[PDB]
Amino acid sequence: VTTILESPYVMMKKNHEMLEGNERYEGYCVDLAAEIAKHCGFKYKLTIVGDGKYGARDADTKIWNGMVGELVYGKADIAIAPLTITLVREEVIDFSK
Amino acid sequence: TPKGSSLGTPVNLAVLKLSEQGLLDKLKNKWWYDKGECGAKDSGSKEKTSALSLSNVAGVFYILVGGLGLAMLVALIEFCYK
Amino acid sequence: PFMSLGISIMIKKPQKSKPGVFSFLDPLAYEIWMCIVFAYIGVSVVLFLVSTNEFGIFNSLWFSLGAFMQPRSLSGRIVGGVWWFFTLIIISSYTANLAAFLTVERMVSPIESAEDLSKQTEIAYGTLDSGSTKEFFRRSKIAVFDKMWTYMRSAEPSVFVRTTAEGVARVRKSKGKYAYLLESTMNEYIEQRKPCDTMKVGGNLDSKGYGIATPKGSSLGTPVNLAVLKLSEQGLLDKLKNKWWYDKGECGAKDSGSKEK
Amino acid sequence: PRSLSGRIVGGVWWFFTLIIISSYTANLAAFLTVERMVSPIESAEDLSKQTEIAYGTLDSGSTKEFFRRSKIAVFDKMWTYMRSAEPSVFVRTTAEGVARVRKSKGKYAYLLESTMNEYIEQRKPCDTMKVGGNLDSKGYGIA
Amino acid sequence: PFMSLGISIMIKKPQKSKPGVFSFLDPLAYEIWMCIVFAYIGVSVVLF
Amino acid sequence: PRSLSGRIVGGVWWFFTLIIISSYTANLAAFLTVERMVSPIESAED
Amino acid sequence: TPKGSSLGTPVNLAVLKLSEQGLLDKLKNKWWYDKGECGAKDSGSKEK
Numbered sequence: 001v002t003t004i005l006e007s008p009y010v011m012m013k014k015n016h017e018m019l020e021g022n023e024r025y026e027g028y029c030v031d032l033a034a035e036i037a038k039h040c041g042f043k044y045k046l047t048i049v050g051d052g053k054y055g056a057r058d059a060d061t062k063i064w065n066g067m068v069g070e071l072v073y074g075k076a077d078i079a080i081a082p083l084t085i086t087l088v089r090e091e092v093i094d095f096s097k
Numbered sequence: 098t099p100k101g102s103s104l105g106t107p108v109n110l111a112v113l114k115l116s117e118q119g120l121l122d123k124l125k126n127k128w129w130y131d132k133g134e135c136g137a138k139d140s141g142s143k144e145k146t147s148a149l150s151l152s153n154v155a156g157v158f159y160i161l162v163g164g165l166g167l168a169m170l171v172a173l174i175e176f177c178y179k
Numbered sequence: 180p181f182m183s184l185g186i187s188i189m190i191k192k193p194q195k196s197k198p199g200v201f202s203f204l205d206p207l208a209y210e211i212w213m214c215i216v217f218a219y220i221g222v223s224v225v226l227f228l229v230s231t232n233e234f235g236i237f238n239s240l241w242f243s244l245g246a247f248m249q250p251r252s253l254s255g256r257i258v259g260g261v262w263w264f265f266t267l268i269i270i271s272s273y274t275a276n277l278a279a280f281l282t283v284e285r286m287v288s289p290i291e292s293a294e295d296l297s298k299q300t301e302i303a304y305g306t307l308d309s310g311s312t313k314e315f316f317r318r319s320k321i322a323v324f325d326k327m328w329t330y331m332r333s334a335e336p337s338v339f340v341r342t343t344a345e346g347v348a349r350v351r352k353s354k355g356k357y358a359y360l361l362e363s364t365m366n367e368y369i370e371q372r373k374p375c376d377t378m379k380v381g382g383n384l385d386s387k388g389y390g391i392a393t394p395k396g397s398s399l400g401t402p403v404n405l406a407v408l409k410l411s412e413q414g415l416l417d418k419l420k421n422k423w424w425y426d427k428g429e430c431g432a433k434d435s436g437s438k439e440k
Numbered sequence: 441p442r443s444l445s446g447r448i449v450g451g452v453w454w455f456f457t458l459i460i461i462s463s464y465t466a467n468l469a470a471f472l473t474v475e476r477m478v479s480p481i482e483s484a485e486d487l488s489k490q491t492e493i494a495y496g497t498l499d500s501g502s503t504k505e506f507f508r509r510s511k512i513a514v515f516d517k518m519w520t521y522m523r524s525a526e527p528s529v530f531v532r533t534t535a536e537g538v539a540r541v542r543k544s545k546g547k548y549a550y551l552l553e554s555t556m557n558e559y560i561e562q563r564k565p566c567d568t569m570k571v572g573g574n575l576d577s578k579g580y581g582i583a
Numbered sequence: 584p585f586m587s588l589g590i591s592i593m594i595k596k597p598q599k600s601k602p603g604v605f606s607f608l609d610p611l612a613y614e615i616w617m618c619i620v621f622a623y624i625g626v627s628v629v630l631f
Numbered sequence: 632p633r634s635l636s637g638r639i640v641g642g643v644w645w646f647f648t649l650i651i652i653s654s655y656t657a658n659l660a661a662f663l664t665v666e667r668m669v670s671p672i673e674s675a676e677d
Numbered sequence: 678t679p680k681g682s683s684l685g686t687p688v689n690l691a692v693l694k695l696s697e698q699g700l701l702d703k704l705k706n707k708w709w710y711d712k713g714e715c716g717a718k719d720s721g722s723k724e725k
Contacts, residue, residue, distance in 0.1 A: 008128040008129065008132070009128075027128060028124055028125065028127075028128045031124050031127070031128075032115075032121075032124060035111075035115055035120060035124075036108055036111050036112070036115075039107075039110075039111040039114060039115070040104060040107045040108055040111055042104075071098070071099050072099070074099075077098075077099070077102075077104065078098050078102075078104055078108065079098070085693075086693070086697070087690065087693040087694055087697055090689070090690065090693055091690070092100065093098065093099060093100055094098045094099070094100055094101075094102065094105050096098070096108050096109040096111075096112045097109060097112050097113055097116075131329070131333075132333070136300075139300060142298075142299075143299075143301070144283075144286045144287070144288075145283070145286075145287065145301075146283070146666070147279065147280055147283050148205075149205070149206055149207060149208050149211070149272075149276050150208060151208055151210050151211050151214075153272065154208075154211050154214075154268075154269065154272060157265055157268045157269065158214060158218060158265075160261070160264075160265070161218060161261055161262065161265040162218070162221075164257060164258065164260075164261030164262075165221070165222065165225055165258060165261070167257065168225070168254050168255065168257050168258045168261075169225070171253060171254050171257070172229065172254040172255075175253070175254060180577075180579065180584060180587075182577070183577045183579065183584075183587040203459065237442075240442060240444045240447075241442040243444075244442045244444065244447045244448075244451070246451075247447060247448055247450070247451025247452075247454075248451060248454060248455070249454065267652060270458060270462065271652060271655055271656040271659060272659060273462055274462040274465055274466055274656050274660070275466075275656050275657070275658075275659035275660035275662070275663050276659075276660070276663045277462060277463060277466035277467075278465070278466035278467075278469040278470065278660040278663070278664070279660055279663035279664040280466075281466060281467055281469075281470040282469065282470050282473050282474060282660075282664045283664065284470075285470060285473075285474040285476065286474065382573070386584075386586065386587045388579075388584065388587065411577070414509075414510055414511060414512060414576075416577075417512065417576060417577070418511075418512070421512075438483070438486070446629070446630050449626060449629055449630060450630075453626050456622070457619075460611075460615075460619060463611075464610055464611050465656075466660070467610045467611070468610045469657075469660060471610070473664070477596075477597045477598045478597040479594070479596075479597035480594070480597070481592070481594060482592065484592060487592070493594075495592075503590055506590060537593075538593070541593055541594065541595055542595065544595065545595065545599075546594060546595035546597070549592055549593060549594045550592075550593045551590055551591070551592055551593070552590070552591065552593060553588060553589075553590065553591070554588045554589050554590070554591040555586070555588045557591045557593050558591075560593070566596070567595065567596040567598075568593055568594070568595065568596060569593070569594065569596060570591050570592065570593060571591075571592050571593075571594055572591070572592055573589075574588065574589025574590060574591055575589055575590040575591070576589045576590055577587065577589055578587070578588050578589050579584030579585075579586060579587045579588060580584060580585060580586045580588070581584050581585060582585065672723070672724075
């Protein structure tokens with residue numbers, strides 16, 4: 001599960017240094033992840049996107065970046081974050097309601 | 098979710114299920130208002146305050162000195178005509 | 180049960196009052212009393228210029244009498260009119276403002292029940308960090324008690340105390356800014372202990388009760404049970420409580436003054 | 441005229457009465473603004489210390505028999521009063537007692553079980569209220 | 584016990600009004616009406 | 632002196648100003664009690 | 678649209694396209710506010 005560090009959706013817990021795995025993070029999307037995983041029945045590993053971007057497309061290189069990118073290039077299986085549902089993205093990936 | 102994924106449909110329905118159970122609204126309230134620190138409906142519910150300043154009273158002081166000055170002007174002219 | 184009880188609220192003994200001429204300088208700010216005096220002599224000096232050394236003293240005392248408030252010389256005429264309109268506004272402001280200090284003085288309401296602790300936030304409150312009292316709110320599905328727990332669960336700094344003594348101390352040192360929730364029995368007792376600065380407010384939050392415990396299938400079982408019922412009906416139980424709580428206590432003085440009010 | 445002596449007297453006296461009449465006006469505005477209902481009470485001991493407000497219980501029941509047999513200081517005096525109070529401070533039924541409290545303009549108090557009392561307080565025209573804590577500790581149970 | 588109770592007191596519901604000109608002496612306390620009268624003659628004697 | 636004509640004028644004018652200054656005082660007291668401070672207006676059009 | 682329809686994906690994208698072009702917001706304004714009308718009762722409700 002890929003996600004971005006954006007309060008109050010996904011934030012670093014107080015004693016995140018003394019924690020590991022998914023317990024390190026807390027927020028709206030962090031809870032939303034557990035809920036989705038419960039109704040879909042699957043284990044997950046919360047990971048922060050590298051470049052820390054959402055999902056844009058460089059005109060020149062025509063390359064996707066951020067979470068939307070990590071989805072198209074098989075880096076992640078799903079994106080649980082404040083990702084805006086745009087036409088430019090709906091063409092390359094799938095957006096739930 | 099990646100185009101043509103297996104988690105596609107399942108997650109979609111899951112989101113709809115969560116919203117109808119009011120779980121989504123609940124989560125937002127948890128991180129926005131509940132976990133919040135500010136307050137608006139509580140600041141209006143706070144019946145307490147009282148103290149006089151000077152601002153309002155000051156406006157009446159300027160109109161006074163203005164009247165005194167106007168008189169000091171009417172005085173001078175009177176002595177001149179006489 | 181030989182004694183019915185529950186969870187109660189403990190606050191710091193409130194009380195205060197006094198007169199002082201400083202309740203007159205408050206409505207009207209000290210800064211305003213000053214300027215109204217500066218403009219006061221500021222008018223008695225302007226009028227003084229309208230009307231040999233003593234002749235100026237007798238006049239300055241006459242304009243000071245025209246100052247100490249109550250022909251058609253247009254000059255000083257509009258001065259008396261404008262000064263009158265000036266003092267009119269001020270005395271009107273003083274009157275209006277003074278009405279507000281008494282209206283708000285009545286607006287203030289004191290905690291009467293638990294629901295009062297949830298409807299406000301100015302006065303913090305908590306329970307013991309460990310015990311049935313704390314676990315009560317946590318597991319309680321009741322409307323009011325729910326919100327209360329939600330607050331205490333994330334309240335910072337910690338609204339929970341280590342021991343009961345710490346809780347009472349927190350109520351006695353917060354000037355009425357912190358309330359402590361504990362068993363009514365222990366609370367009522369604290370109210371009867373020096374310096375008599377704590378009081379229980381409102382009814383209990385739940386219905387509990389102490390009892391005499393006897394091993395399952397004991398011979399003393401039935402006998403003791405009936406004994407407790409007999410003691411209560413003879414008012415012996417109520418008598419005992421009065422003996423150790425109020426009689427042996429030391430506060431019928433702060434209660435005789437709390438009669439009114 | 442300008443007799444400075446008595447002159448400042450008239451001025452200071454004027455400033456004095458000015459404050460007072462202003463206070464009277466402001467204060468008078470308060471009661472008519474908030475206008476919160478009052479209520480006299482409450483600790484039973486208050487019923488024994490006074491006589492202006494009559495009070496009684498049901499002519500028959502554990503409530504009446506309680507005061508009669510009670511050896512407690514306060515409750516003792518209360519019973520002594522009700523035992524010889526004229527006219528009869530005791531009522532036939534609970535409905536009669538409530539009616540007596542609603543028609544005495546606060547001159548008559550009725551002593552009854554807290555359970556039934558609390559319920560009455562939540563019934564139209566909402567003109568009755570329970571005051572102070574209970575006088576004794578009872579309890580219902582499954583038999 | 585599934586419900587603890589006891590004997591309670593039931594009184595009327597405060598709510599009403601009355602006259603007696605005593606609603607005018609209340610705003611201004613009886614003690615204040617007195618002193619304002621003492622100072623009243625206290626000034627008429629100083630002027631005297 | 633007692634010029635009935637302009638006499639009632641001074642009386643009526645006095646009763647007039649009495650009401651006004653009373654209104655100002657009363658209204659100002661309301662203001663000093665509630666003392667609510669609004670603000671601009673919500674509407675991008677604003 | 679019926680489950681597994683041909684118009685499925687096309688219509689979906691069409692809706693997204695219309696919203697981004699502000700065409701959806703435009704339509705609403707046309708039938709809700711413009712179509713009025715009132716258009717007068719809202720200018721008085723300004724709360725001045």
